[PDB]
Write a protein that binds this ligand. Structure first.
Ligand SMILES: NC(=O)c1ccc[n+]([C@@H]2O[C@H](COP(=O)([O-])OP(=O)(O)OC[C@H]3O[C@@H](n4cnc5c(N)ncnc54)[C@H](O)[C@@H]3O)[C@@H](O)[C@H]2O)c1
Ligand SMILES: NC(=O)c1ccc[n+]([C@@H]2O[C@H](COP(=O)([O-])OP(=O)(O)OC[C@H]3O[C@@H](n4cnc5c(N)ncnc54)[C@H](O)[C@@H]3O)[C@@H](O)[C@H]2O)c1
Ligand SMILES: NC(=O)c1ccc[n+]([C@@H]2O[C@H](COP(=O)([O-])OP(=O)(O)OC[C@H]3O[C@@H](n4cnc5c(N)ncnc54)[C@H](O)[C@@H]3O)[C@@H](O)[C@H]2O)c1
Ligand SMILES: NC(=O)c1ccc[n+]([C@@H]2O[C@H](COP(=O)([O-])OP(=O)(O)OC[C@H]3O[C@@H](n4cnc5c(N)ncnc54)[C@H](O)[C@@H]3O)[C@@H](O)[C@H]2O)c1
Ligand SMILES: Cc1cc(C)nc(SCCO)n1
Ligand SMILES: Cc1cc(C)nc(SCCO)n1
Ligand SMILES: Cc1cc(C)nc(SCCO)n1
Ligand SMILES: Cc1cc(C)nc(SCCO)n1
Ligand SMILES: [Mg+2]
Ligand SMILES: [Mg+2]
Ligand SMILES: [Mg+2]
Ligand SMILES: [Mg+2]
Lengths: 268, 268, 268, 268
């Protein structure tokens, strides 16, 4: 009698046990969902990490820049879940921007090849995944992607914020296509989460100034949030994704749900 | 094992069996919630209407313009739910604007006394209710109000749209206060719902031109909505309110969730 | 050969030489406009203040809560500018909220009578003025009101922020009506300006906590603004209003132009 | 005594006499500006077109995808305007998306190589141009780019709308960098303009369905616009760009000014 009882849901984006997608997968299993996982490049690592989830789940390789992987994806999922069965949910929790497009490297100094790779992985791939998977989704289904509010510019995030602006636009178009299948498409805009990479950035991995700036941004977030914000806890974010994967928001599509403590609704 | 098992929730705004609040109450009871209802003025009528809900619920009188009603409200609720028990949820589903502030009466011709009454009932009362009820709400609790997207002007809605703009602002402030109690505050922006009053307006009760305009607005809404919009079905709206009343969006406050078929995310 | 050569423009809202409207009037006269001024209550004071403008201008009494003043206003303006002449511009620079609706008085403690008076003066009056003056405006004309960005809640501003949210909504409706006359309606959202009242508030006139909060808000504004923000200089704001009064933004209506140093476009 | 007297302004984007940039250049010259023009690929054609402007202007070659052109650009401009002189204004009026990313080709069928080229030319190039030209701009200067409101998805525009979403994000970052030079960065969001390409699209050049959809969008725009919208007249758009190039909006940066008849502020 979980929120997601009987649902078959694909979850991309697990790389470590601090990945937002690891917590999305954990909560969805706690709520009765049957998962198929996708991983990029380091499949041995990802299998070992995902062994710590409450239930075993098949793991498929998916590099979103690889056209072959995308073309075979629905067939591979169908074999993992059994012929005649379809998915009820898809989670996109994939993002990347080269170091030249984030941190202390000046905004104007990111070469376009680097920005293009970041926008491919972070924004275009949301459409790629929907194209691949809508033919094997049931009516009433739900596609969810991870967003970080790009409405205002911020220090250090730089071209990653541009990629999120493109992602929000992509989501509105995916909703139009997904609608033909009786399927919803939405993003969850999360507050900052202390993943391994984010901890490294605050520790100065992309320059001292960028680290300082991101730390300040984190502190302001909790201060602004009327219910507070705990950057070490991805669970409220994971629960929000599961809310969208459920049947409890059946008239919301092309949209953005903010799991940020309410910080974006306050100026100070 | 419902979504709202064990929760005690106050629901205002029932006047007929087509009231959005009637469907909110029905769905919340189907999901295990124990309700306290509030009604305005025609309490005999409201009791008879609410007899059709799946479970019996105490009905309290509440005129949001009446300071005495608001001052006694927490005590009356506490006696209905039993001393030592508190509310987990509050639903504001209250709206009013005099006929001079809607329909074919020119926008410039609404007297301020009429606009003020409409803003009192439709916007200020969201703060009034929160003031009255936060002292008897549990941590983890949720306050939800009903909104109609006022970001762009529209024909006929006129000063009611202005009241909704004020309501959205009020909600962001209520979230700051509610946060001190561990309580969330959010609005659900619904698409148009064919309540008795809305059917009457399309039938020309506020002038022929206003009727025509609202009919066109309804038709465009379903056309824009990537998953469609059924104005005769309040259930998707009710489910969305219950989503916010649950523990599944624990990091969303001061915010607006759109239960509109995705229509606001599309231009045509 | 000024920006506003040959234009006849009404300017409300002068009370001291630090009033934003004083600087709007000064810049418009420097740019060739012929003004009619309106003042509330302390007409002797206002006449003495306005004697410091570059050119003499007729001063008319206007209490926006007074129905008689509003009904006679067009006739009084026509006699000041001469029969057969019409206005090309109207400036609304009027705002008020009782002390119970701003500062350290808790948000929930503002009585509705006080909030209603504030919304009357600050929001409804924008429509009142347009109703009164559109019949004596020329095609190509411009109505401009003063706004403070209410998209996010902030400390101390409280019900004044709610009034601004209502004002933004009112402006979109006024644009629909003004359009019938070939007239534009827009708001200028200014950054914080150190008027006499604002200096007093920072000095603690509405409580110490509110003062502290507003000071912090001012400091953050200049820090966020990519071109900086000088709260002691109303001239950039005045120039922006004159831009809207000119023929140089002829396809902008129902809209908001931000004269805030770009602060609202940045998170930190 | 024009609006732009004494200013030196670079204008990109002229290809035909229906180019929005042709009208921007014409109005800026009528207002006293001294121009430097940039053109892509068909320089013989562009020279002949630009011979119809009120004043002669030097024409420089600029392919925004060509790193060499961008690296030599400031030097070439300096030789055209004379050593010791700098620019006061820069106009980006450059946009492109391959046919696979617009029209009736399904959204999911645009290959990433095509989308990437479109985002390079339409969004990244706004940053490229600013990088190249800020070192030769005067304090008080202004960078302006052309936008089409991408806040909601629309039929046929598809990946071009995604590129505009990215452009709006880029503009907020460019404003931060431009601020260091005392320079503003803003976009003008225009309503639809019947350029040669747009006429061709309505005539069915990108498929019949896409043509039909764009025609409907155009008709709705004028209907929504409180002051109307004339798609055959680029002059109101050009005047708006010149407003931003002037000293009359000195506190607006990282922002978007809508020259759309007010259509985006209205639902119907
Ligand atoms: N951490 C934050 O503060 C935060 C805040 C809001 C949103 N988000 C977003 O949440 C999502 C998940 O990120 P995270 O913070 O959990 O970091 P993470 O590093 O744990 O996850 C990012 C994932 O992207 C995957 N990925 C990268 N390139 C790929 C490719 N070519 N094909 C397939 N997958 C690829 C990685 O393998 C990894 O699993 C991202 O979209 C991120 O932008 C993060
Ligand atoms: N029907 C729609 O199309 C639509 C769309 C979006 C949002 N909404 C909103 O949903 C809410 C519920 O409205 P509805 O459409 O279900 O109509 P309704 O007429 O069924 O409900 C409105 C309720 O407001 C109550 N009310 C009026 N004055 C009151 C007072 N002084 N004190 C206490 N209660 C008072 C009425 O008694 C009634 O129960 C309103 O906020 C409305 O604006 C409606
Ligand atoms: N000062 C700021 O930081 C700031 C920032 C953004 C916007 N604004 C807005 O600019 C406008 C002008 O305010 P200001 O800051 O220059 O302060 P101000 O006190 O100098 O001007 C306010 C004016 O409102 C007038 N007014 C009050 N009640 C009235 C009534 N019943 N009828 C007619 N006029 C009445 C007052 O006489 C006064 O002239 C207001 O709308 C204000 O909200 C101010
Ligand atoms: N026409 C509309 O309805 C409309 C509406 C809003 C905004 N806009 C925008 O206005 C701008 C101007 O477009 P237009 O409608 O005047 O069309 P246009 O075809 O006349 O102008 C587009 C220009 O982009 C230039 N360009 C293309 N690739 C280039 C490259 N690699 N390097 C340099 N320049 C290149 C072309 O040479 C051409 O001069 C674009 O940003 C467009 O998106 C157009
Ligand atoms: C919003 C945001 C922040 C960070 C550090 N990474 C990402 S995606 C790269 C994952 O480590 N997205
Ligand atoms: C958005 C909206 C529309 C209507 C007709 N009424 C309301 S409240 C009055 C209830 O019948 N709100
Ligand atoms: C935004 C804002 C701030 C303040 C102090 N007053 C106002 S109107 C009252 C004028 O002194 N408006
Ligand atoms: C918004 C928009 C529409 C169109 C047809 N083209 C462009 S850029 C290509 C120029 O002909 N931008
Ligand atoms: Mg294990
Ligand atoms: Mg019964
Ligand atoms: Mg004098
Ligand atoms: Mg010639």
């Amino acid at each position: 009698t979980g929120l997601l009882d009987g649902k078959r849901i694909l979850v991309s984006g697990i790389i470590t046990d601090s990945s937002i997608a690891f917590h999305i997968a954990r909560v969805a299993q706690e709520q009765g969902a049957q998962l198929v996982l996708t991983g990029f490049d380091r499949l041995r690592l990802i299998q070992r990490i995902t062994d710590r989830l409450p239930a075993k789940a098949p793991l498929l390789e998916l590099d979103v820049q690889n056209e072959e992987h995308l073309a075979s994806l629905a067939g591979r999922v169908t074999e993992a879940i059994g012929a005649g069965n379809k998915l009820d949910g898809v989670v996109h929790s994939i993002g990347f921007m080269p170091q030249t497009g984030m941190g202390i490297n000046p905004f104007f100094d990111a070469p376009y090849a680097d920005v293009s790779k970041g926008i491919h992985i972070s924004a275009y791939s949301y459409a790629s995944m929907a194209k691949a998977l809508l033919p094997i989704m049931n009516p009433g289904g739900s596609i969810v992607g991870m967003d970080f509010d790009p409405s205002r510019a911020m220090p250090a995030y730089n071209w990653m914020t541009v990629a999120k602006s493109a992602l929000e636009s992509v989501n509105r178009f995916v909703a139009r296509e997904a609608g033909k299948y009786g399927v919803r498409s939405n993003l969850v805009a999360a507050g900052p989460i202390r993943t391994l990479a984010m901890s490294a950035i605050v520790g100065g991995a992309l320059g001292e100034e960028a680290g300082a700036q991101i730390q300040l941004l984190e502190e302001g977030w909790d201060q602004r949030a009327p219910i507070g914000w705990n950057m070490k806890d991805a669970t409220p974010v994971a629960k929000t994704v599961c809310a969208l994967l459920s049947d409890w928001l059946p008239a919301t599509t092309g949209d953005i749900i903010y799991a940020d403590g309410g910080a974006h609704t306050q100026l100070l």
